[PDB]
């Protein structure tokens, strides 16, 4: 019933930009936390951005790494999470994942299949 499907990755040269999308269904969107996590090809999961539900004023929190370059947003009418990425560089190349929280106290209870982003011309 719960679905998360990312989209928006691609191949891009340094300094360029992209907008990731996360379409969802199977739950009342506005009531859950949503997040963006990425994993460079070697490496470890890395939390990037996060945005809370309506009861929490849709507050957000960013990782210093993407601070001021990335910006998260959510379209509550359509139940879609996005991510505007600017001034991209090598350390940004990875698979990006969207995830929704859990009411009993958990981040990333559900994950989308993630999309790829490759930087470097």
């Amino acid at each position: 019933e719960v679905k998360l499907v990312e989209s928006g990755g691609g191949l891009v040269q340094p300094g360029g930009s992209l907008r990731l999308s996360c379409a969802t269904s199977g739950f009342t969107f506005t009531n859950y936390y949503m997040n963006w996590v990425r994993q460079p090809p070697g490496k470890a999961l890395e939390w990037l951005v996060s945005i809370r539900n309506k009861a929490n004023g849709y507050t957000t929190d960013y990782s210093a790494s993407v601070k001021g370059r990335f910006t998260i947003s959510r379209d509550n009418s359509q139940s879609i999470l996005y991510l505007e990425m600017n001034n991209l560089r090598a350390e940004d190349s990875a698979t990006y994942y969207c995830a929704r929280g859990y009411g009993y106290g958990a981040w990333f209870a559900y994950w989308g299949q993630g999309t790829l982003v490759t930087v470097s011309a």
Binding site: A44, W111, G112
Partner: protein
């Protein structure tokens, strides 16, 4: 930035043996609301991560009961009592109490040769 130190990096096991993975936060991880948002994740080869344990210790629904988490202060352990082929992959501990939220370096559970 609260650092999450995971150990070991490589844990070779034999199917059916117990196995323990540990984490180590560099500071307390108690959120101001009282909860300790320490979870464990499992990323199988090619798949996306899966939630195993939340709030240090609560096994997420649908997760095999061979998984269990525990800990106190800055020490957290994820235990697997009977390793199944399907449990092979990379495990990540994660703290979602203090910003910026942080994962451990990951622990690769693999077949012992």
């Amino acid at each position: 930035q609260v650092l999450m130190t995971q150990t070991p990096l490589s844990l070779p096991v034999s199917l059916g043996d117990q196995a323990s993975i540990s984490c180590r936060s560099s500071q307390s991880i108690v959120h101001s609301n009282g909860n300790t948002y320490l979870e464990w994740y499992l990323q199988k080869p090619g798949q996306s991560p899966k939630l195993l344990i939340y709030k240090v210790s609560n096994r997420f629904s649908g997760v095999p009961d061979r998984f269990s988490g525990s800990g106190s202060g800055t020490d957290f352990t994820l235990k697997i009592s009977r390793v199944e082929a399907e449990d092979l992959g990379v495990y990540y501990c994660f703290q979602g109490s203090h910003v910026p939220y942080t994962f451990g370096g990951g622990t690769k559970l693999e077949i012992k040769r």
